[PDB]
Amino acid sequence: MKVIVLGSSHGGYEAVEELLNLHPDAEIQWYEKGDFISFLSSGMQLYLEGKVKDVNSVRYMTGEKMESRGVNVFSNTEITAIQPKEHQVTVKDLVSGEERVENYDKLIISPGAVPFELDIPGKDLDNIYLMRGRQWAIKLKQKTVDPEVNNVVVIGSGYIGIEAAEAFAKAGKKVTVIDILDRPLGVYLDKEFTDVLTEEMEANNITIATGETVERYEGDGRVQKVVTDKNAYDADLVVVAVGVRPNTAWLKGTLELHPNGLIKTDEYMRTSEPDVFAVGDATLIKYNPADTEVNIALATNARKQGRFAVKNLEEPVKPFPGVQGSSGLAVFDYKFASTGINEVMAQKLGKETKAVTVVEDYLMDFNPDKQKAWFKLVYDPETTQILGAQLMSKADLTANINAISLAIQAKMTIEDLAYADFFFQPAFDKPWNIINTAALEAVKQER
Numbered sequence: 001m002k003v004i005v006l007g008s009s010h011g012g013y014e015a016v017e018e019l020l021n022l023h024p025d026a027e028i029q030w031y032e033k034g035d036f037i038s039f040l041s042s043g044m045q046l047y048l049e050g051k052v053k054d055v056n057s058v059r060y061m062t063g064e065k066m067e068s069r070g071v072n073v074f075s076n077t078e079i080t081a082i083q084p085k086e087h088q089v090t091v092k093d094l095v096s097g098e099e100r101v102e103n104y105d106k107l108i109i110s111p112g113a114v115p116f117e118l119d120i121p122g123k124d125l126d127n128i129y130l131m132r133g134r135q136w137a138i139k140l141k142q143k144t145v146d147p148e149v150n151n152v153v154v155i156g157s158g159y160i161g162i163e164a165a166e167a168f169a170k171a172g173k174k175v176t177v178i179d180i181l182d183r184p185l186g187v188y189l190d191k192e193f194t195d196v197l198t199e200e201m202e203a204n205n206i207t208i209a210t211g212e213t214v215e216r217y218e219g220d221g222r223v224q225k226v227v228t229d230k231n232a233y234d235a236d237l238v239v240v241a242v243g244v245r246p247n248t249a250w251l252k253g254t255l256e257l258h259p260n261g262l263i264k265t266d267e268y269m270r271t272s273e274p275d276v277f278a279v280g281d282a283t284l285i286k287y288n289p290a291d292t293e294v295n296i297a298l299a300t301n302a303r304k305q306g307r308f309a310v311k312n313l314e315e316p317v318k319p320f321p322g323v324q325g326s327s328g329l330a331v332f333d334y335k336f337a338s339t340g341i342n343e344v345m346a347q348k349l350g351k352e353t354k355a356v357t358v359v360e361d362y363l364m365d366f367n368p369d370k371q372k373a374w375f376k377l378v379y380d381p382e383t384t385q386i387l388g389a390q391l392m393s394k395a396d397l398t399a400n401i402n403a404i405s406l407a408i409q410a411k412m413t414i415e416d417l418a419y420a421d422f423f424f425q426p427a428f429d430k431p432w433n434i435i436n437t438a439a440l441e442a443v444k445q446e447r
């Protein structure tokens with residue numbers, strides 16, 4: 001049984017791991033069009049801030065290690081087309097230009113996504129950079145110490161844009177973040193959280209320009225200005241972090257795709273064609289808070305889907321359990337985490353919700369280490385089932401969001417969480433901990 005896996009990033013990598021422990025006998029080929037196997041773009045911020053010195057260590061697998069396990073690794077080799085009925089792919093060795101056709105019994109593809117670019121005048125003056133992969137990581141890092149870079153503009157105020165803004169602010173640059181949306185990180189956090197984070201970023205000389213549409217880049221050879229409908233900003237470097245496009249144009253006509261380019265798959269990771277499975281950023285995933293399919297481009301999702309594709313390789317026997325969209329990040333001193341439905345998600349899905357927010361010290365009064373914490377619990381108005389939660393503090397309390405992720409999956413209610421058994425010891429929390437306290441508030445709001 002010969003299985004070909006496309007892609008060495010999170011989705012493709014975990015498919016290879018699950019093949020090794022479920023089908024040790026199989027002939028496994030692993031293809032990567034790039035030069036470097038399994039670079040962790042999630043670790044790029046630690047490298048840009050100087051926490052990690054060696055860019056080549058920001059990875060989780062090497063071709064050498066997988067070959068020791070009997071996998072055939074082909075780096076610098078691109079799968080150019082799939083011929084699904086005859087079960088063949090044509091591959092191109094990018095160093096020699098050779099093209100050959102390869103047959104498979106089963107094919108798992110995790111083609112991923114590419115950074116979205118602004119197709120505007122000035123489009124590629126020098127020093128308009130993107131943020132994905134090893135080559136961009138290295139170029140961004142060289143700019144961090146360049147004395148000619150004084151002003152950097154990042155377009156996009158989502159997760160990746162704020163990571164870039166923090167990294168260049170810490171390198172001593174002046175940073176402006178521009179976006180059409182009215183709040184940074186709105187996809188992850190509601191207004192009472194992003195108001196605090198905006199103040200924190202502005203204290204560290206990041207200007208946030210919201211509600212503005214970028215119209216063109218101006219400069220002579222290299223960028224010098226970014227002009228929006230409302231303003232013109234000086235820029236020595238631009239980081240475009242607007243979003244991501246599925247890497248699927250080459251699949252048009254071969255596999256069924258959604259209007260937005262995402263690959264259609266069912267709950268067993270099967271595509272429209274026999275024996276080809278698709279995983280990761282290029283697909284939709286079962287979203288349990290709202291019982292629907294949503295594109296949630298996270299490494300956690302791609303890894304779980306990669307293993308479930310291998311579980312359903314011979315028979316559709318194991319439907320995907322679904323996810324809650326859990327995410328977490330530190331922005332200067334604040335560490336936040338969120339899961340499930342928040343205001344932007346509810347708007348997009350047309351879902352009605354209720355919520356309580358508690359802001360108080362997470363340790364008892366007499367303990368001098370006490371610090372404020374913000375917690376918001378979102379629940380269904382009819383059933384009072386838990387639909388989401390967001391938490392933030394300068395203290396690290398983020399592991400508590402893992403309990404809310406499970407509560408949503410288990411369809412627990414505000415009353416279940418109000419009296420759930422969480423430990424107490426006064427160096428760590430209060431007799432009713434942060435989750436108990438917000439659920440107790442919600443029980444009062446519904447009485």
Ligand SMILES: Cc1cc2nc3c(=O)[nH]c(=O)nc-3n(C[C@H](O)[C@H](O)[C@H](O)COP(=O)(O)OP(=O)(O)OC[C@H]3O[C@@H](n4cnc5c(N)ncnc54)[C@H](O)[C@@H]3O)c2cc1C
Binds near residue numbers: 078079
């Ligand atoms: C800056 C940054 C920070 C992030 N931080 C986090 C985080 O902290 N936590 C988290 O959960 N997620 C994070 N993510 C998201 C996460 O990295 C992605 O969700 C995940 O990498 C998706 O994996 P994938 O396999 O679907 O695709 P991709 O990572 O896009 O990889 C696809 C791979 O397949 C290769 N390929 C594509 N086409 C072909 C082909 N035709 N032939 C051969 N090879 C091909 C590509 O070269 C690429 O290596 C972050 C992403 C970025 C960019």
